[PDB]
């Protein structure tokens, strides 16, 4: 018995060695970053020992494609810093992790993460300059040469009786190394909502519902318009368009009390380009001549035929007053107004590319990601420019999740029930399967799975078979195996779905093999809940159909929850 | 063992130290990992 | 061994008690909760 | 504490906590529960013989040698553990098992009712022998079982086998209490009798 030990047990690697680990809670504050970036963090409570463990408090960065923090379910005892996309920091003896490697960069404090410290973080775009600070004291620059795919985000992960702080802006402390605060990318349309990081689950009111998996260098670049040839057939109509685009721009100003003046001054209400398309020369009138040529070139950029289909065809102002047409009565097509958004996008990205040189003007982003008010002035220039083409008669013509319950409850006898109350619609394959279903394949795409893509209405044994209905957001699906007469029934809010062959029984005349497992799927970004008894009153349509036909909920059996499985994105 | 990159590719990793400012403290490591032709 | 794309993994019956805010972003998780976890040594990775 | 721990694994670790820690002092007292060597002290003199029955009357004389636990240290003999943290968990575990068993849940914690009950009661019984559960905890165990319930239930084969051995020390607690009583009589009786030994 001594001899069994020494040859086997101190070696520690032939047996399956084990150790308790605190449940790593991972987070993220909603906001992707891909310029030089910066954020801050203060600690409020730690409790460094409430277990027989130093309670962890890791701070760093991670990518979108990569870092799926399944809780403690990756490499050696899980957690933060474990990934090659993870670069964590902050602990008893502050130093970092990279692939969970506790390399030992020193500091002017060597102090534990306690209830007092202020963590100062940084990152650059295209420069991998990541180095953090405690209370604004340099911690000896660390991180270099890492790839950038997706957009990096703050992470902070920890587990004890902890409250801490971000500081994003509502700061308390901010030196400028690198620089831009993290409040700068709150802008686009999204508000901030801090979440639990990538989250196969979420804990809700009925029981826990299912989210999976996700949907993922923002530099503004226009498409080239100068390498596009306009024939002299179209140059004359373009100069007719440039003659129309100049005087409507003259009419666009003078409604606000403007007038012609040689001094180019906006406060004095005098502008040098309100006098005619002919009298302003071809560098002063080329603000309207070249912009109507490059618009019809950008029409030929996106693959559109801007050609002769029809023959080309009031407030008195203070210096020039013609009368072109009636333009907004002729209705633009949806392909034509989309090109007006394209002319708004292509021209503004030229200015965003030209202001790469020129710090950091607040509209230095692409046209799609900026706010909708700067989108109004760029579209209304190109929506009226689209009305000059239709007014003159020129037509413009333009992975997945797998869910299954506990294999012990691969039920084998009787009439059983569960339900699928469904929240968001998409690829939602719901049903039953034998335990031999490879989650490595897509769901329902074999002989061992009896599934039902709820939305799109098609049911799944060995591929397509249409059936039933497609559910609306907030419909209970309901699945009903009869183990005796080997049939399987579907409902939709307690309303039994008929075959396209003419019967209520969905999957009919299988054989009971090795039990059957309750099975659902998720597409790209869809949400669903699987309630398996436990609260028999919350079975919303088992009361209608069910109790009558003698079906069984799951947790009539149990007193515990059913711990399901999913195939990881990892 | 930490590798979850299911791509058809060359994708991936160096750490530096400091000496209270640095001044070198550069060379530590490279792997993540390895590629030939 | 081949890096196959996906194999089943647990629901992890109890995980998180997260709390956060807007004006100051007061991040908070409370309950001390642990794994019954091992690691297989010779193809090293950790499972529970 | 683990519920979603598998059935096989449940039985193992419960056996470890016995075999790593409890087993040696447990089997130490298995021999000595049949020995019954008692002093003639005042606490031995007192014991009542009766409720003025109850097996968990802890007047707790005759020897039954004492466990002495060495802390796990690598500077160098019975490995030490939180006995008193553990004992409260076990009553917690039983009432987690009895109540869920009496409401007839077919979850059960291991996967079968075997692994639900057996290696807990084994852990209990090994802990029962070792002279723990100060004598209001055992009254709670009798409230859990007699009731004056776990024993009421249908139990499978090796389940009730373990309950059988469980019940045996309970009968042995009746036995020692009667033996501690009869010494309480005889110490009083011989002192009367030694007077009658010397009227001569």
Short mmCIF file of N, CA, C and O in Angstrom, two decimals, chain B residues 1-24:
data_model
loop_
_atom_site.label_atom_id
_atom_site.label_comp_id
_atom_site.label_asym_id
_atom_site.label_seq_id
_atom_site.Cartn_x
_atom_site.Cartn_y
_atom_site.Cartn_z
N UNK B 1 -2.25 23.39 -25.38
CA UNK B 1 -3.63 22.98 -25.38
C UNK B 1 -4.68 24.07 -25.58
O UNK B 1 -5.76 23.80 -26.10
N UNK B 2 -4.39 25.29 -25.14
CA UNK B 2 -5.28 26.43 -25.41
C UNK B 2 -5.18 26.82 -26.88
O UNK B 2 -4.29 27.59 -27.30
N UNK B 3 -6.11 26.27 -27.65
CA UNK B 3 -6.24 26.59 -29.05
C UNK B 3 -7.66 26.28 -29.46
O UNK B 3 -8.08 25.12 -29.38
N UNK B 4 -8.40 27.28 -29.91
CA UNK B 4 -9.81 27.07 -30.31
C UNK B 4 -10.14 27.73 -31.64
O UNK B 4 -11.30 28.04 -31.96
N UNK B 5 -9.09 27.87 -32.45
CA UNK B 5 -9.19 28.56 -33.71
C UNK B 5 -9.48 27.55 -34.80
O UNK B 5 -8.57 26.98 -35.39
N UNK B 6 -10.76 27.36 -35.06
CA UNK B 6 -11.20 26.59 -36.17
C UNK B 6 -11.30 27.52 -37.40
O UNK B 6 -12.38 27.83 -37.88
N UNK B 7 -10.15 27.90 -37.94
CA UNK B 7 -10.06 28.61 -39.23
C UNK B 7 -9.00 27.93 -40.13
O UNK B 7 -8.21 27.17 -39.66
N UNK B 8 -9.01 28.22 -41.42
CA UNK B 8 -8.09 27.65 -42.39
C UNK B 8 -6.86 28.59 -42.62
O UNK B 8 -6.72 29.22 -43.68
N UNK B 9 -6.03 28.78 -41.60
CA UNK B 9 -5.29 30.04 -41.56
C UNK B 9 -3.99 30.04 -40.82
O UNK B 9 -3.63 29.11 -40.20
N UNK B 10 -3.31 31.16 -40.93
CA UNK B 10 -2.27 31.57 -40.02
C UNK B 10 -2.87 32.65 -39.09
O UNK B 10 -2.85 33.85 -39.42
N UNK B 11 -3.34 32.25 -37.92
CA UNK B 11 -3.73 33.23 -36.85
C UNK B 11 -3.03 32.91 -35.49
O UNK B 11 -2.51 31.81 -35.34
N UNK B 12 -3.06 33.79 -34.48
CA UNK B 12 -2.58 33.47 -33.10
C UNK B 12 -3.50 34.14 -32.07
O UNK B 12 -4.14 33.51 -31.23
N UNK B 13 2.61 36.50 -30.14
CA UNK B 13 2.12 36.53 -28.76
C UNK B 13 3.33 36.63 -27.83
O UNK B 13 3.90 35.63 -27.39
N UNK B 14 3.73 37.88 -27.57
CA UNK B 14 4.93 38.17 -26.81
C UNK B 14 4.59 38.99 -25.59
O UNK B 14 3.62 39.78 -25.57
N UNK B 15 5.40 38.79 -24.57
CA UNK B 15 5.25 39.52 -23.35
C UNK B 15 6.58 40.25 -23.12
O UNK B 15 7.66 39.73 -23.46
N UNK B 16 6.50 41.45 -22.57
CA UNK B 16 7.68 42.17 -22.12
C UNK B 16 7.60 42.40 -20.62
O UNK B 16 6.54 42.28 -20.01
N UNK B 17 8.73 42.73 -20.01
CA UNK B 17 8.79 43.05 -18.59
C UNK B 17 8.99 44.55 -18.49
O UNK B 17 9.01 45.25 -19.51
N UNK B 18 9.14 45.02 -17.26
CA UNK B 18 9.77 46.30 -17.06
C UNK B 18 10.76 46.30 -15.92
O UNK B 18 10.75 45.44 -15.06
N UNK B 19 11.61 47.31 -15.94
CA UNK B 19 12.60 47.52 -14.88
C UNK B 19 12.30 48.87 -14.20
O UNK B 19 13.20 49.69 -13.97
N UNK B 20 11.02 49.04 -13.86
CA UNK B 20 10.39 50.28 -13.30
C UNK B 20 10.20 51.39 -14.35
O UNK B 20 9.45 52.33 -14.11
N UNK B 21 10.88 51.28 -15.49
CA UNK B 21 10.53 52.04 -16.72
C UNK B 21 10.57 51.09 -17.92
O UNK B 21 9.90 51.27 -18.95
N UNK B 22 11.42 50.06 -17.78
CA UNK B 22 11.75 49.17 -18.88
C UNK B 22 13.23 49.33 -19.26
O UNK B 22 14.12 48.73 -18.62
N UNK B 23 13.44 50.05 -20.37
CA UNK B 23 14.75 50.37 -21.01
C UNK B 23 15.38 49.22 -21.82
O UNK B 23 16.08 49.49 -22.78
N UNK B 24 15.20 47.97 -21.37
CA UNK B 24 15.00 46.85 -22.30
C UNK B 24 13.80 46.06 -21.79
O UNK B 24 12.64 46.38 -22.16
#
